[PDB]
Amino acid sequence: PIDLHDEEYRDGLEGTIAKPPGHVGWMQRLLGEGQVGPIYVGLWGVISFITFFASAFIILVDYGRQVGWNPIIYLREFWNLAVYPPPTEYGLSWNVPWDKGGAWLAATFFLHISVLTWWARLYTRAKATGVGTQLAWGFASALSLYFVIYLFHPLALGNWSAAPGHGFRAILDWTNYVSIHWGNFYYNPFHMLSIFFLLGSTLLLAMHGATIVATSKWKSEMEFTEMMAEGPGTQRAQLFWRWVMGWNANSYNIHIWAWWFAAFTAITGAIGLFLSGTLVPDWYAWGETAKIVAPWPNPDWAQYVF
Amino acid sequence: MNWIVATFMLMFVLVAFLPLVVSLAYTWVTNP
Amino acid sequence: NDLVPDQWKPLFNNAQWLVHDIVVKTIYGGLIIAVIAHVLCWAWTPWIR
Amino acid sequence: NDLVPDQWKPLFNNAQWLVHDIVVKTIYGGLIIAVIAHVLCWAWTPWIR
Amino acid sequence: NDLVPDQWKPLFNNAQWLVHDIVVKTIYGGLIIAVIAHVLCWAWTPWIR
Amino acid sequence: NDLVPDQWKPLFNNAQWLVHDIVVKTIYGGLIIAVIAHVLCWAWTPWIR
Amino acid sequence: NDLVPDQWKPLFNNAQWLVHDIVVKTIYGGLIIAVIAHVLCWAWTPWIR
Amino acid sequence: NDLVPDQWKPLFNNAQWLVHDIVVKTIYGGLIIAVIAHVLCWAWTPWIR
Amino acid sequence: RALPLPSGETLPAEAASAEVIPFSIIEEFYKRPGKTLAARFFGVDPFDFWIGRFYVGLFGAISIIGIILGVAFYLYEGVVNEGTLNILAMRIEPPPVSQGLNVDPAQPGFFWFLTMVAATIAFVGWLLRQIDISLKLDMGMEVPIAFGAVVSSWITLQWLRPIAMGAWGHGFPLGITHHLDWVSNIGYQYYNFFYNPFHAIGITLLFASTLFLHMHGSAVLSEAKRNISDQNIHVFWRNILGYSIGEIGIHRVAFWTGAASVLFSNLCIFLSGTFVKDWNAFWGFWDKMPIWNGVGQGALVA
Amino acid sequence: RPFEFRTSVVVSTLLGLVMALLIHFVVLSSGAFNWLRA
Amino acid sequence: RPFEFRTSVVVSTLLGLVMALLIHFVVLSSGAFNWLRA
Amino acid sequence: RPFEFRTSVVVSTLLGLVMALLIHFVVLSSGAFNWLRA
Amino acid sequence: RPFEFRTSVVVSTLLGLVMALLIHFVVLSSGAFNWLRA
Amino acid sequence: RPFEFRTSVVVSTLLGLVMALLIHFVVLSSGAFNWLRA
Amino acid sequence: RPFEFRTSVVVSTLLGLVMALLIHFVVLSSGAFNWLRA
Amino acid sequence: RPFEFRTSVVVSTLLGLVMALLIHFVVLSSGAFNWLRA
Amino acid sequence: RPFEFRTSVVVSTLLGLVMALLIHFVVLSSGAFNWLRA
Amino acid sequence: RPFEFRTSVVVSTLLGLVMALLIHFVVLSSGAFNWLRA
Amino acid sequence: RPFEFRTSVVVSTLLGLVMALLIHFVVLSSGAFNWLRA
Amino acid sequence: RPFEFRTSVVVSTLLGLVMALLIHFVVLSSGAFNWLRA
Amino acid sequence: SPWPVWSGYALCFVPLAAVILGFIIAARFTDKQATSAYLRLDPAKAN
Ligand code: BCL
Ligand code: BCL
Ligand code: BCL
Ligand code: BCL
Ligand code: BCL
Ligand code: BCL
Ligand code: BCL
Ligand SMILES: CC(C)=CCC/C(C)=C/C=C/C(C)=C/C=C/C(C)=C/C=C/C=C(C)/C=C/C=C(C)/C=C/C1=C(C)C(=O)CCC1(C)C
Ligand SMILES: CC(C)=CCC/C(C)=C/C=C/C(C)=C/C=C/C(C)=C/C=C/C=C(C)/C=C/C=C(C)/C=C/C1=C(C)C(=O)CCC1(C)C
Ligand SMILES: CC(C)=CCC/C(C)=C/C=C/C(C)=C/C=C/C(C)=C/C=C/C=C(C)/C=C/C=C(C)/C=C/C1=C(C)C(=O)CCC1(C)C
Ligand SMILES: [Fe+3]
DSSP letter string, chain C: --SS-GGGTTT--HHHHHHHHHHHHHHHHHHHHHHHHHHHHHHH--S--
**Nearest residue in chain T measured CA to CA from U22:** T14
J-chain residues within 8 Å CB-CB of K26?
28, 36
Residues with Cβ within 8 Å of residue Q36, at least 6 apart in sequence: G47, N26, N27, N30, N32, Q28
Indicate which ligand has the atom closest to the C-alpha of T1: 6
Q: What are the chain Q neighbours of N27 within 8 Å (beta carbons)?
A: 36
Cβ < 6 Å from ligand 1: which residues? C 27; D 26-27, 29-31, 33-34, 38, 41, 47; J 16, 19-20, 23-24, 27; L 36
The candidate with the shortest Cα–Cα distance to L20, out of S21, J19, F25, is J19
For residues L24 and L30, what is the distance between their CA atoms, to the nearest angstrom? Answer: 10
CB I179 within 8 A of CB I91: no
Ligand 3 pocket residue status of L27, Cβ below 6 Å: yes
- Tell me which amino acid residue L16 is: G
C48 Cβ neighbours under 8 A, 6+ residues apart? D44, J35
CA atoms of I295 and A75, how far apart (whole Å): 11
Span between the terminal Cα atoms of chain M, in Å = 48
* Nearest ligand atom owner, CA of D40: 1
Nearest residue of E to residue L27 by CA position?
A: E47
A259 contact partners, CB below 8 Å, separation of at least 6: A134, A138, I213, I214, I217, I218, I221
One-letter amino acid for residue A157 of the chain: L
* A94 neighbors K25 (Cβ within 8 angstroms): yes
Interchain pair R32, P36: CB under 8 A: yes
DSSP state of D7: G
Give CA–CA dist G43/G26, Å, rounded: 26
Gap between the Cα atoms of H4 and H14, Å rounded: 6
> Are the CB atoms for A78 and A60 separated by under 8 Å?
no
Q: Which chains touch E (3 or more CB pairs under 8 A)?
A: D, F, J, L, M
CA angle I175, I176, I181 (to 5 degrees): 70
Chains that touch T (3 or more CB pairs under 8 A): S, U
Distance CA O19, CA O16 (A): 5
User: Is C8 annotated for ligand binding?
Assistant: yes
Chain J positions touching A43 (Cβ under 8 A) are 10
Q: How far is Q31 from chain I (nearest CA, A)?
A: 12
S11: nearest Cα among I71, T10, M17: T10
Closest approach of Q12 to chain G, Cα-based (Å): 21
Distance of alpha carbon T22 from alpha carbon T8, whole angstroms: 21
Q: Which chain J residues are closer than 8 Å to K15 by Cβ? A: 17
Calculate how close chain U gets to A183, using CA atoms only, in Å: 15
Q: D 29-48 residues with CB below 8 A of L?
A: 47-48
Backbone angles phi, psi at M17, to 5 degrees: -65, -45
Query: Distance from first CA to last CA of chain U, Å, rounded?
Result: 65
Binding site membership of L24 for ligand 3 (Cβ less than 6 Å): yes
- If one counts every other C-beta atom within 10 angstroms of the C-beta of residue I131, the result is 21
Question: Is the C-beta atom of O27 inside 6 A of ligand 9?
Answer: no
Q: Which residue has the CA at smallest separation from atom 8 of ligand 4?
A: N24
CA distance A15 to A20: 13
The Cα-based distances of A259 to J30, K37, L4, Q31, U15 in angstroms read 46, 45, 43, 58, 19
Ligand 9, atom 26, residue with closest C-alpha? O13
Helix-strand-coil percent breakdown of chain R, rounded to 5? 65, 0, 35
> Which whole-number Å values give the CA distances from C29 to A14, C22, C24, I12, K15, in the listed order?
33, 11, 9, 55, 18
- I79 with O31: Cβ contact below 8 A: no
Contact S34/U at CB under 8 A: no
Determine phi and psi for A139, rounding to 5 degrees.
-65, -30
First to last CA, chain F: 51
Contact P25, R21 (CB under 8 A): no
| Helices and strands: H and E segment counts in chain R | 1, 0
What is the Cα A5 distance to its own chain's centre? 31
Measure the CA angle with vertex B28, ends B25 and B32; round to 5°: 145
S10, with CB counted inside 10 A (0-12, 13-18, 19+), is: middle
How close F45 gets to chain M, by Cα (Å)?
6
CA distance P33 to A244: 42
- Distance (angstroms) between ligand 4 centre and the Cα of B17 equals 42
Q: Could you tell me if residue A169 is left (phi over 0), alpha (psi between -120 and 50 degrees) or otherwise beta?
A: alpha
The answer to whether S36 and O30 have CB atoms below 8 angstroms apart is yes
Spatial separation of the C-alpha atoms in residues I161 and I165, rounded to whole Å: 6
On whether C39 is known to bind a ligand per the annotation, the reply is no
Return the residue whose CA atom lies nearest to atom 38 of ligand 8.
Answer: G19
User: Are the CB atoms for K33 and C48 separated by under 8 Å?
Assistant: no
Query: Is R10–I46 a contact, with Cβ atoms under 8 angstroms apart?
Result: yes
- Most ligand 4 atoms within 8 A of CB, residue of N9, N22, N23 to mutate: N23
End-to-end Cα, chain C, rounded Å: 52
- The DSSP 8-state label assigned to residue E9 in this structure reads T
Write the CA distances from I97 to I78, I277, I278, M11, N21, integer angstroms: 20, 17, 20, 60, 51
With a 6 Å cutoff on the Cβ, whether P33 touches ligand 5 is no
Neighbours of I254 (CB within 10 A): 27
End-to-end CA distance of chain N: give it in Å, rounded: 49
Give the list of residues 6+ apart from residue G43 with CB closer than 8 angstroms, or none: none
A15-17 and A39-41 strand pairing:
antiparallel
What 3-state class would DSSP assign to A11? Answer: strand
Count Cα neighbours of H42 within 13 Å in the Cβ-side half-sphere.
8
Structure-determination approach: cryo-EM
Measured in angstroms, the resolution is 2.8
The burial of C37, by beta-carbon neighbours within 10 Å (0-12 exposed, 13-18 middle, 19 or more buried), is given as: exposed
- Shortest Cα–Cα distance, N28 to chain Q (Å): 10
Instruction: Report yes or no: I253 and I142 within 8 Å, Cβ to Cβ.
Output: no
| Alpha carbons A299 and A282: distance in angstroms, whole number | 22
